[PDB]
Write a protein that binds this ligand. Structure first.
Ligand code: HEM
Ligand code: HEM
Ligand SMILES: CNCCCc1cccc(CCc2cc(C)cc(N)n2)c1
Ligand SMILES: CNCCCc1cccc(CCc2cc(C)cc(N)n2)c1
Ligand SMILES: C[C@H](O)[C@H](O)[C@H]1CNc2nc(N)[nH]c(=O)c2N1
Ligand SMILES: C[C@H](O)[C@H](O)[C@H]1CNc2nc(N)[nH]c(=O)c2N1
Ligand SMILES: [Zn+2]
Lengths: 409, 415
């Protein structure tokens, strides 16, 4: 079927044909929808049709479907799968696969940029020291003195499952979290477990509120190893407020480079368990979730107090006032330090434009409303009013288990 | 489908187990290859004899299970009396007790409603003896006055006769009992509520004389027994309204905003045991954001962010200053303050969502689940600083239920 999606603000109706091409499951059925579940539920024989499908859409994308080059590649991949229990992507294929996995990421609001992605091939890597060198170069390239540039670094694909390359950090750059005797938590509570694994591995914690975690790198199934990122490569921003001169005294900072390192890139049936990728921040990521989640840095009440707000009744919306002021500060700080950042109004605007683009040239755009709508001021951004269809296209980024649950030393 | 499904809360790590989904009765719109969770709405004939039997049995069984009389003499006797009735008259009539049970459970089952902690406290008015539009008018006035209660609002539903052959439907043509008119001007601007322009034009055609103001209460347009609909003015003393003022900004009063106290949906269809109640207006009380964020600040609605931002002396040329966000909070502070001051029941989105989490947890324990539509349950401002944002939810359709239905002017055969 052709499916329609309506924007209820503009009455614009788009027509989705692209969904007919998906094979992977969403988790929903005709009787139960799991649209708000965060994580719902290879061999020679499995591997070839997947390989064939990806190769097919690649040569289709470059308008050479059924070409001699196409036929040979199909033949080449078959004999290699047969003889080696796997196969290797051409460079052009790797780049195409990585850009399209971003393009297909239904939960990403930043996808208007999908084709501007710098791809670093690290499939010749064999050691954690190698991984560290590769990741350092990535961080340096992507940070670019504040003029952030999208990048992905791709390490060797999974083979027998026992020689996995893994970045054990969930992001390349995050702040430590410490469990106080107090019972309270210093730093970022989200990272308390990982911080303790690093300490247990020999890392000497400064026990501060914003200590950059070391890299914990696993290469070829071996034990992971600790590395400190050279600090001149770690760009950070002191958060200050344009009208509240007391905001600086709060002592808040964040890092400029968002770099997810715990996901799995899947291309043509090949699995890349280590593929750190980075872009730039949407302000709410920091100002709403990182800072104001009860299970994170949880600063709302501190801020509302310096704002001298009545905090006795919820209906004074003191939390909503403090939240807006915090997010103003973050945007103002990054902008003032010339560090790339986008606000949720601009970002969601761009995404509606991107959707339109994708429907026009590709016949659809998979999108996850639950994730796309910003965590504050939802209905005054255009994506709130935009119906979206969610479905799974490959190449893709997938979740994988945390390494400390499968690996033994 | 698996017998046990798990939902997690990511803020509190609390995990809940759902078994109620097994009783799901029809389509969500989703398939295993595509999710339609953000789609708003995913023949003039009626249920046949053979279609009606198992639907009725299913409901009656469920009713007698709820009163701990499953398999009793009374249960089996009711089943037989219903069956005889469907067989000889092609339909059947609900007992008052079943009617009340069914309405309460349609609310309880309403996956998009955050106020369901209140579901068992619902005044049901049986208007199945109604025959004319004047009678519908009488019943609706009585509803409004009861539910309003001088500002101490009480949830209520009034239920008109069920559908028979489909050519004799009772319908309230209004989408809500109380709403403000909208008027398209020759120059393209809109006066009043742009959402209601179509319906307003219908009323005007039907004989209504429009004051052509910013907040004119619309008349009722009421259809009884499949006849042409008729106009009635709701007595203005029965329409409680709240002028919007702000605790700090004294200029806010000058914006001349007000809203009505009673939210009352009148265009949905109530389905009980396969019976179809096409006119079933129900009402509760407002969550502040419904008015402060959607009614006032949607671009296609009253759209007042700009005017408010101006009076707040905010820098409005860069989006990153968050001038829209700042004014939105203030508008919603005013709405809550104005309702509380006039002692009209209202709930803020923090209190409401926390109550719904408690409600949901209780439902999981006593009922084995609680269907919920995250896209609708999460508030339209400040989403992640409410507890429902972090709550995984399962969405599925149980019956009895409230359902959407075509707009009556689209289907009506004019006499
Ligand atoms: C360039 C600027 C970018 C912006 C502004 C952006 C924005 C976002 C945001 C706000 C989210 C929600 C994540 C959360 O709430 O935790 C997200 C998710 C995601 N992004 Fe993007 N992103 C950008 C670049 C990228 C790049 C370069 C990639 C990969 C090459 C990418 C892949 C993804 C994926 C796979 C998700 C889903 C996360 C999950 O399922 O956990 N994004 N993005
Ligand atoms: C008593 C206090 C109540 C509160 C605070 C409340 C709150 C809400 C809210 C905020 C919505 C979303 C509305 C929107 O965004 O348009 C909603 C939807 C809904 N409510 Fe409740 N409600 C209440 C009472 C009731 C009652 C008494 C019923 C039925 C007997 C009911 C049935 C529904 C239904 C069926 C929807 C679905 C909306 C749709 O799909 O169009 N509610 N409610
Ligand atoms: C269990 N989830 C693990 C991954 C969590 C995650 C995945 C992808 C993105 C994010 C948010 C961080 C981010 C990443 C990127 C590339 C850009 C951005 N603005 N923000 C978190
Ligand atoms: C397509 N229109 C169908 C009805 C739209 C609608 C249904 C249910 C609720 C609402 C919002 C009004 C409302 C009703 C009730 C009972 C309570 C409340 N807080 N708010 C709109
Ligand atoms: C329960 C729900 O799935 C979960 O809280 C989601 C909701 N939407 C989100 N949206 C974004 N962008 N990021 C998130 O982490 C989440 N969390
Ligand atoms: C496209 C999207 O489903 C639509 O804008 C929804 C989003 N969530 C909503 N949530 C509520 N409570 N009410 C609404 O009208 C909507 N609109
Ligand atoms: Zn779904």
């Amino acid at each position: 079927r052709f499916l329609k999606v309506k924007n209820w603000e503009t009455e614009v109706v788009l027509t989705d044909t692209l969904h007919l091409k998906s094979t992977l499951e969403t988790g929903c059925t005709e009787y139960i929808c799991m649209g708000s579940i965060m994580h719902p539920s290879a061999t020679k024989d499995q591997l070839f049709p997947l390989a064939k499908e990806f190769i097919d859409q690649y040569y289709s994308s470059i308008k050479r479907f059924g070409s001699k080059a196409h036929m040979e590649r199909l033949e080449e991949v078959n004999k290699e799968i047969d003889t080696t229990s796997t196969y290797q992507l051409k460079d052009t294929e790797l780049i195409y696969g990585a850009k399209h996995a971003w393009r297909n990421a239904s939960r990403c609001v930043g996808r208007i940029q999908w084709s501007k992605l710098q791809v670093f091939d690290a499939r010749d890597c064999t050691t954690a020291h190698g991984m560290f060198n590769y990741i350092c170069n990535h961080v340096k390239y992507a940070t670019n003195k504040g003029n952030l540039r999208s990048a992905i670094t791709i390490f060797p694909q999974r083979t027998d499952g026992k020689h996995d390359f893994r970045v054990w950090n969930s992001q390349l750059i995050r702040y430590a979290g410490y469990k106080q005797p107090d019972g309270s938590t210093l730093g970022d509570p989200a990272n308390v477990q990982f911080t303790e694994i690093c300490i247990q591995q020999g890392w000497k914690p400064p026990r501060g509120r914003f200590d950059v975690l070391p890299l914990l790198l696993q290469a070829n199934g071996n034990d992971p190893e600790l590395f400190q990122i050279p600090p001149e490569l770690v760009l950070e921003v002191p958060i200050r407020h344009p009208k509240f001169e007391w905001f600086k005294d709060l002592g808040l900072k964040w890092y400029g480079l968002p770099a997810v390192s715990n996901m799995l890139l899947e291309i043509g049936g090949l699995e890349f368990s280590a593929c750190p990728f980075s872009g730039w921040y949407m302000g709410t990521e920091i100002g709403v979730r990182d800072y104001c989640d009860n299970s994170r840095y949880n600063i709302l009440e501190e801020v509302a107090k310096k704002m001298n707000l009545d905090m006795r009744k919820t209906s004074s919306l003191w939390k909503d006032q403090a939240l807006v002021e915090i997010n103003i500060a973050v945007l103002y700080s990054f902008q003032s330090d010339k560090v790339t950042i986008v606000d949720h109004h601009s970002a969601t605007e761009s995404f509606i434009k991107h959707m339109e683009n994708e429907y026009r040239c590709r016949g659809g755009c998979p999108a996850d409303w639950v994730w796309i709508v910003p965590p504050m001021s939802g209905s005054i951004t255009p994506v709130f009013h935009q119906e979206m269809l969610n479905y799974r296209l490959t190449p893709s980024f997938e979740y994988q288990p945390d390494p400390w649950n499968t690996h033994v030393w």
